[PDB]
Design a protein around this ligand. Sequence first.
Ligand SMILES: Cc1cn([C@@H]2C[C@H](O)[C@@H](CNC(=O)Nc3ccc([N+](=O)[O-])cc3)O2)c(=O)[nH]c1=O
Length: 199
Amino acid sequence: DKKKGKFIVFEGLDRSGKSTQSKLLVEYLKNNNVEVKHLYFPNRETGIGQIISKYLKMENSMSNETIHLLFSANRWEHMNEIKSLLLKGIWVVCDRYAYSGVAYSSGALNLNKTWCMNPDQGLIKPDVVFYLNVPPNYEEIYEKVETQKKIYETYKHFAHEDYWINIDATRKIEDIHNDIVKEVTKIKVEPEEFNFLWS
Ligand SMILES: Cc1cn([C@@H]2C[C@H](O)[C@@H](CNC(=O)Nc3ccc([N+](=O)[O-])cc3)O2)c(=O)[nH]c1=O
């Protein structure tokens, strides 16, 4: 059966204003009587995300491949829920997804892009990705401007795709929000078949 709700993902560097923009969009949709669930990745839904939290805080040392696969497993454990919501007509707004998986691991950990993409192959594909673009310039494992710049580069792997909407996120919060709302209004309203990464 068809996907009735719409699925919006935010991407961007650590300091790009995703939680503010994703929150404002959720508010906006609820105010237009759209039913909507706000999700983010990584999260601590299960023991998998608890391990990810220790990694981010540098409490444990993990191999590149080990952590990369936990980040993907954290998404797969939400596919039943995301499929169910979208089937019912409930929208999903999600802060980070598989594109973070690929950009952070290939950029910061120098893992091969294709190897990074494989485990997320088959995830539900969003309707659109808003990339909050903030050039990095002058607590957590990847917080260090040179590492941010490496990840800024690997994020360009997706820059040419039809679903990828670049948003200049150096602008005023209100103007970024208005730009995002303008784009969301363009989304097709009718139900559609589910698509999957990396189609
Ligand atoms: C979903 C996903 C995310 N990531 C990285 C590591 C971490 O989970 C995230 C980057 N960290 C942040 O964006 N940190 C952050 C800290 C403070 C704020 N803030 O609002 O002040 C916002 C973001 O993105 C990653 O490496 N692989 C993944 O699959």
